Amino acid sequence: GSSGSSGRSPFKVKVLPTYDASKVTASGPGLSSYGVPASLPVDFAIDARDAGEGLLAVQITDQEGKPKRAIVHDNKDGTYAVTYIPDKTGRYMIGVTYGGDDIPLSPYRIRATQTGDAS
Numbered sequence: 001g002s003s004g005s006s007g008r009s010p011f012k013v014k015v016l017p018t019y020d021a022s023k024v025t026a027s028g029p030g031l032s033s034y035g036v037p038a039s040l041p042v043d044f045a046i047d048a049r050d051a052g053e054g055l056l057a058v059q060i061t062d063q064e065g066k067p068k069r070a071i072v073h074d075n076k077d078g079t080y081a082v083t084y085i086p087d088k089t090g091r092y093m094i095g096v097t098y099g100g101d102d103i104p105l106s107p108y109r110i111r112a113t114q115t116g117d118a119s
Contacts, residue, residue: 019052021101030084031094031108038114043073043083046096054099058082063090089114 029036030044046056060068066088073081086092089112096106 017052017099019054019099020050021054021098021103023051024048024054024096024098024103025105026096030082031110033110035111035113036086038086038089038112041083041085043071043081046080046082048078048080048098051098054101055097056080057097058084059095059097060084060086061093061095062088065093068092086112089117 024046025048026044026046028042028044030042036042056072058070058072060070062068068084068086071083073083075081092108092110092112094106094108094110096103096108
């Protein structure tokens with residue numbers, strides 16, 4: 001089941017938005033394919049060329065799918081930084097979104113390289 005359909009407007013055209021998720025990309029250690037240090041404060045960079053401006057949001061989950069703490073850094077220089085401390089190593093799935101629209105790049109598959117953690 002579902003419901004809603006809320007929100008109206010007295011005047012609004014059907015033109016194209018200035019922003020564009022598709023034009024959104026990210027680079028850095030936080031998304032390093034080679035691997036990332038477990039229990040280490042890592043952050044990536046979001047450089048937008050033709051993505052314009054759009055509500056950015058990050059969702060970090062674990063192999064089980066638990067909510068992870070994600071900090072938001074504002075540079076106001078045409079980019080966006082995000083720090084995340086992966087405590088519980090494992091398959092991490094990051095779901096980046098811009099202006100209520102997920103990019104064709106996400107989700108993101110990363111592996112937290114941990115050592116020891118004997119139980």
